[PDB]
Nucleic acid binder design. Structure first.
Ligand SMILES: [Cl-]
Ligand SMILES: [Cl-]
Ligand SMILES: [Cl-]
Ligand SMILES: [Cl-]
Ligand SMILES: [Cl-]
Ligand SMILES: [Cl-]
Ligand SMILES: [Cl-]
Ligand SMILES: [Mg+2]
Ligand SMILES: [Mg+2]
Ligand SMILES: [Mg+2]
Ligand SMILES: [Mg+2]
Ligand SMILES: [Mg+2]
Ligand SMILES: [Mg+2]
Ligand SMILES: [Mg+2]
Ligand SMILES: [Mg+2]
Ligand SMILES: [Mg+2]
Ligand SMILES: [Mg+2]
Ligand SMILES: [Mg+2]
Ligand SMILES: [Mg+2]
Ligand SMILES: [Mg+2]
Ligand code: NA
Ligand code: NA
Ligand code: NA
Ligand code: NA
Ligand code: NA
Ligand code: NA
Ligand code: NA
Ligand code: NA
Ligand code: NA
Ligand code: NA
Ligand code: NA
Ligand code: NA
Ligand code: NA
Ligand code: NA
Ligand code: NA
Ligand SMILES: [Sr+2]
Ligand SMILES: [Sr+2]
Ligand SMILES: [Sr+2]
Ligand SMILES: [Sr+2]
Ligand SMILES: [Sr+2]
Ligand SMILES: [Sr+2]
Ligand SMILES: [Sr+2]
Ligand SMILES: [Sr+2]
Ligand SMILES: [Sr+2]
Ligand SMILES: [Sr+2]
Ligand SMILES: [Sr+2]
Ligand SMILES: [Sr+2]
Ligand SMILES: [Sr+2]
Ligand SMILES: [Sr+2]
Lengths: 49, 142, 142, 150
RNA sequence: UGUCCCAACGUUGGGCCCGGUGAACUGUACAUUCCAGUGCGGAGUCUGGAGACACCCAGGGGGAAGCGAAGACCCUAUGGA
RNA sequence: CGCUCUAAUUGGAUGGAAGUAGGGGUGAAAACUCCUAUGGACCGAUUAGUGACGAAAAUCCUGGCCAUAGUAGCAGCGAUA
RNA sequence: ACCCUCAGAAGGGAGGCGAAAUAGAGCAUGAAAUCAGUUGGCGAUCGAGCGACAGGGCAUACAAGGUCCCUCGACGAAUGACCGACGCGCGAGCGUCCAGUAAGACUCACGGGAAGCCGAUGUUCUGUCGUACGUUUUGAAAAACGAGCCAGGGAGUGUGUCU
């Protein structure tokens, strides 16, 4: 759930901004965002044997 | 009173006629800079080569003036590829034992930068005695 | 005010464009040329049509400007400029090594360049630079 | 802050610095530029005349909208930055003082080196229409001066 | 009855110059342009010419198909309400 | 070709490691390497592995910063001080 | 610490400590964007994808590159003469012989020279070519879309099954 604990939402078109989820004027959740989730991180379910 | 470099600093290798010819060719022909397209137009774009991939890329389409594109045709002669400009083949050395098996008539040694002054001094005197030139010699006042 | 010309050309009864062409060629080769008796230089064709062309050039213009010469002096100098890359270093150097004069300011007579002479006994359809200038409204100072 | 950016022979030189001064950096560049090469004493008389309004300071780079001044030489735009001038007078007072404490003839020494450097901005905020606020900052300026025997 | 013919003079606050304070919009790059042409047919940047010594102040806004908003109109989506 | 960490084999470093700056050499190239200055403690190579492994771009994200600019505003309100 | 300066527990100067204060308080290192000062190159008559490749100017401590230039000679691919002689053409000019000769890129040897001198690096000038990049598109320099600049961040991953 790292990076997913936020209700951040995108403003969409209209304010001359990229459609990036933001919260309190701060971008979040998405992989390109600082403090956002890891896109394809290490996973516990992976069989390493 | 003056600085002098340790070792066989002026030594030259003995190359076949064909090798001297090819070494001379490599040096005469040279090659383009092969820097990345438009590296000079934007500071965030370094010089490190990257194949131009733009569909409309002028350099990619081979437009005269946009710079040469890396191709196998630019490779240097096998017989000389990699030689130090002197003609010597280089051998990387980290200690005195690395000097063993080195032919001072055909190879010159380059002491890794990490090596300290104490170990370098030993490597340098042993190399000279083995008739081996050291490309990056220590300069001492004599 | 004293022009050390290596060559003095006499444009009297000579086809303007042909002289201009040979003079530009010489100036590019490093020759300092003085063209003399410009008012007597000649241009072939029907006077009424030739005049219309020069009048149109005088009428053209705007804020950026299209300052076209009216004196035979300048008409000829401009004709030569159009045969020189006057905006390039070597071109401006050549152009500035050429000067055109009304009458002959030198003591020497000018030479008549080969192939530029017009034979009045064989031609009636031509006009004089001086005639064009007067028509254009110039002050016949010659 | 800065460190002297130029070498100085302690036996024939005296130094001084201003730190984080809250004044126009653009004005400081103009004043430094103008007094360099002058004698400390000349610099002082010049700055007092600037403050008095008798001598304008040439504004050669930060001159947008600046009206021309007839007394400006070889240039058109100039002004009378009194605040930064007074800061430079403090600097000169410090320099000449240090100079005299060392046995030198302070006022007679030449301003060998003098340069202003922006070390930061004191941040501020100003409320604006439509529910937004924008920056309203103060420049922070360091300035180095090196006096040298004639 | 200055809405108009047809505009004038004046008043107060700005504007302009000086001290102090001191933002924002906007910025691919280059950029002194003009006339024509060309080009995805609406070019400061391509071609041909013309013009063009650098910088600065004030101005009214012709152009940058100016800035500000992933066109509201129209169509399309095995979209929504 | 380059990056991380693991293992085996094998090396470097306070007689100055990594990094950074400027500079020399090699390779078609990814990139490798040396010199000098700074730095002041870690750093490789080969082989077999491991992968949160390579950016110029997404009106991309965060931080820092320049031009804009000593420019706009610090006048306008029946309370001109 | 002490001293000097200053309106001054400020700041500055000088000084003391330490291997180091360019370790002096968000105080290990200290990139880029970028700013001040300054060195080199260019610069107030001149033109715009900012360069690539050639070639000139000026600039250059050492180290890590050491080459380079001119006479002459040797070798000498494709190509390839002048002149002279003879013969054709209205003429521009051509043919035959001299002759596949002289010449001919590179490379080398002898003799002489260069050490800012050769390479290289910075900048600038000349020549040739040249309207970014990525994307959308039949067609992009585009008056189609994106970005102010830089650094860092930023996109084929796991389980199960199948081939
Ligand atoms: Cl290969
Ligand atoms: Cl005109
Ligand atoms: Cl031209
Ligand atoms: Cl006739
Ligand atoms: Cl500022
Ligand atoms: Cl050869
Ligand atoms: Cl893939
Ligand atoms: Mg995270
Ligand atoms: Mg770049
Ligand atoms: Mg103004
Ligand atoms: Mg409100
Ligand atoms: Mg509009
Ligand atoms: Mg839309
Ligand atoms: Mg509708
Ligand atoms: Mg519905
Ligand atoms: Mg091994
Ligand atoms: Mg990265
Ligand atoms: Mg890409
Ligand atoms: Mg403005
Ligand atoms: Mg620090
Ligand atoms: Na939360
Ligand atoms: Na598992
Ligand atoms: Na004619
Ligand atoms: Na005209
Ligand atoms: Na200026
Ligand atoms: Na003046
Ligand atoms: Na004046
Ligand atoms: Na009225
Ligand atoms: Na306008
Ligand atoms: Na944006
Ligand atoms: Na050069
Ligand atoms: Na697109
Ligand atoms: Na494009
Ligand atoms: Na277009
Ligand atoms: Na901005
Ligand atoms: Sr909308
Ligand atoms: Sr080292
Ligand atoms: Sr000719
Ligand atoms: Sr300015
Ligand atoms: Sr206005
Ligand atoms: Sr720096
Ligand atoms: Sr990644
Ligand atoms: Sr700013
Ligand atoms: Sr008031
Ligand atoms: Sr108001
Ligand atoms: Sr001290
Ligand atoms: Sr043009
Ligand atoms: Sr031959
Ligand atoms: Sr970045």
């Amino acid at each position: 759930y790292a990076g997913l604990r936020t209700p951040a939402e995108s403003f969409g078109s209209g304010r001359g901004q990229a459609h990036v989820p933001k919260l309190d004027g701060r971008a979040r959740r998405v992989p390109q965002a600082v403090k956002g989730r890891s896109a394809h991180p290490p996973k516990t379910e992976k069989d390493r044997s | 009173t003056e600085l002098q470099a340790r070792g066989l600093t002026e030594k030259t290798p003995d190359l076949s006629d064909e090798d001297a010819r090819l070494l001379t060719q490599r040096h005469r022909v040279g090659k383009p800079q092969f820097n990345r397209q438009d590296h000079h137009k934007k500071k965030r774009v370094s010089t490190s080569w990257r194949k131009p991939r733009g569909q409309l890329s002028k350099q990619r389409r081979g437009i005269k003036g946009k710079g040469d594109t890396v191709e196998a045709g630019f490779r240097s002669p096998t017989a000389v590829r990699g030689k130090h400009p002197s003609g010597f083949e280089e051998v990387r050395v980290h200690n005195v034992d690395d000097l063993e098996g080195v032919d001072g008539d055909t190879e010159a040694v380059r002491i890794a930068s990490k090596v300290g002054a104490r170990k370098r001094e030993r490597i340098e005197e042993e190399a000279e005695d083995a008739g081996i030139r050291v490309l990056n010699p220590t300069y001492v006042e004599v | 005010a004293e022009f050390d010309a290596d060559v003095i050309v006499d444009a009297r009864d000579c086809i303007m464009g042909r002289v201009a062409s040979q003079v530009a060629e010489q100036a590019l080769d490093g020759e300092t040329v003085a063209v003399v008796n410009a008012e007597r230089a000649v241009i072939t064709g029907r006077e009424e049509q030739i005049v219309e062309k020069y009048e149109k050039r005088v009428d053209i213009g705007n804020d950026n400007g299209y300052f076209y010469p009216k004196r035979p002096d300048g008409i000829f100098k401009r004709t030569i400029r159009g045969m020189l890359p006057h905006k390039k270093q070597r071109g401006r150097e050549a152009f500035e090594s050429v000067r055109v004069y009304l009458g002959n300011p030198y003591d020497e007579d000018g030479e008549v360049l080969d192939g530029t002479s017009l034979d009045r006994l064989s031609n009636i359809k031509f006009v004089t630079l001086g005639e064009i200038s007067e028509t254009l409204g110039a002050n016949k100072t010659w | 802050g800065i460190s002297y950016s130029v070498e100085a022979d302690p036996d024939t030189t005296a130094k001084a610095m201003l730190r984080e001064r809250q004044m126009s950096f653009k004005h400081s560049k103009a004043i430094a530029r103008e007094i360099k090469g002058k004698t400390a004493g000349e610099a002082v008389d010049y700055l007092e005349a600037v403050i008095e309004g008798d001598q304008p300071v040439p504004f050669k780079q930060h001159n947008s909208g600046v009206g021309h001044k007839s007394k400006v030489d070889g240039w058109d735009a100039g002004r009378y930055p009194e605040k930064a001038s007074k800061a430079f007078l403090d600097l000169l007072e410090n320099a000449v003082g240090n100079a005299d404490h060392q046995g030198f003839d302070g006022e007679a020494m030449t301003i060998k080196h003098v340069a202003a450097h922006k070390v930061g901005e004191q941040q501020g905020r100003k409320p604006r229409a439509m529910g937004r606020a924008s920056a309203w900052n103060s420049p922070q300026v360091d300035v180095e001066l090196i006096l040298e025997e004639p």
